[PDB]
Amino acid sequence: MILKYPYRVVDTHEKLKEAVTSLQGARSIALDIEAFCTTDQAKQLGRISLVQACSDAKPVVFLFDVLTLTPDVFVKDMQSLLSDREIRKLFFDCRRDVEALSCQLGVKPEGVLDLQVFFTAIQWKLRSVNRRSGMGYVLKSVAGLTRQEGDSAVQTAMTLGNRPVWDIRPLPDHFLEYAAGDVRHILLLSNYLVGNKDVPVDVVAVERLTAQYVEHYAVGKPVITEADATPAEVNRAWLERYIGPGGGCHFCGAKGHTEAECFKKQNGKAKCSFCGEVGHTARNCFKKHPQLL
Ligand SMILES: [Zn+2]
Ligand SMILES: [Zn+2]
Incomplete structure (x- = not known):
């Protein structure tokens, strides 16, 4: 259903006020940015062109045309909801977006939750993996x-x-x-x-x-x-402090996978040489040894 939300371009002051009114009623707002490509292709995002918002208060994607509106007009109406810690702002890797909001718009959002970091925190708790995964991998692993x-x-x-x-x-x-x-x-x-x-x-x-x-x-x-x-990982000291010790396989003891993924566990199960079923040995097979039924 969320996948079918239409977009609405917000490029007038009137449309901006209506969008802000909607977003002020949300509990969570997903955020994203489109920035000018840079010739250097440097870490810092280029000039902000759009900010995108999708919240749980209204079935719609707001496409804020910051270039047209100008940052001054956009920030003046968005600043308080961005600073409102009671409204969760959702990001998938917030690092460069946050830097662009701070540098270009002069705003620091409050109440942020980074879902790419969330997925890595789970990978850390379960597997001692601190790698960052891309959006496609996370959607498949989490949502299917x-x-x-x-x-x-x-x-x-x-x-x-x-x-x-x-x-x-x-x-x-x-x-x-x-x-x-x-x-x-x-x-x-x-x-x-x-x-x-x-x-x-x-x-x-x-x-x-x-x-x-x-x-x-x-x-x-x-x-x-x-x-x-490196860009594709999450600070291990921060994971230890806020998530806790990294996990590992309860069956073999190795970090990097869980017992559900453990090859040693699956390969070590009894597999009947006579009927092929996992879970019993041929010596105990009712099919090979009817004198046991
Ligand atoms: Zn294992
Ligand atoms: Zn058998």
Whole structure:
């Protein structure tokens, strides 16, 4: 259902006020950004072009045209809901987005939850894995969904990065569709990760871990020293402090997998040489030895 939310372009002051009114009623708001491609293709996001929002208060994806509205008009109406710690702001890897909000818009969001960090926290608690996984892998592992990929032309342009890409006005439909996709996926993901008994990590602990990332990356200037040893992982000391010791396989003792994934466990089960069933040996097989039925 969330996957079918339509988008609405917010590029006037009137539309901005209506969107803010909707978002103020939410408990959670999924957030994302489209920025100008940079010729350097540097860590810091380029000029903010869109901010995207999808909340649990209304079936819609808001595409805020910051370029058109201007950051000053956008921030003035969005600042308080972004600073409102009672409204959860959901991100999938918030690091560069937070830095762009701080540097370009002058705002530090409060009440952030990073769902990519959430998935890694689970991988840490269960397997001592601190790797960050991409959106497609997380959607499949958590929700079972195969992510529809963005328009390949939009993706090619961004990978080339020899032009801004997102400066074009009006935006073509497949650019707007591309821009709306991830915040749908983020709100959908929060349904599986937040308020779920079967998730082996407290949401509050991932809120505290995420807050370390917001504090590190919202400092009003470009971040030089990264929080993580490589871009594709989560600081191990932060995981130990907020999530706890890393886990491992209860069956063989190794880190990196769980007992449900353990090859030694499955391969070590008795397998009947006579009928092939797992769980009993041929000596105990009723089919081979009817004198046992
Ligand atoms: Zn094992
Ligand atoms: Zn048998």
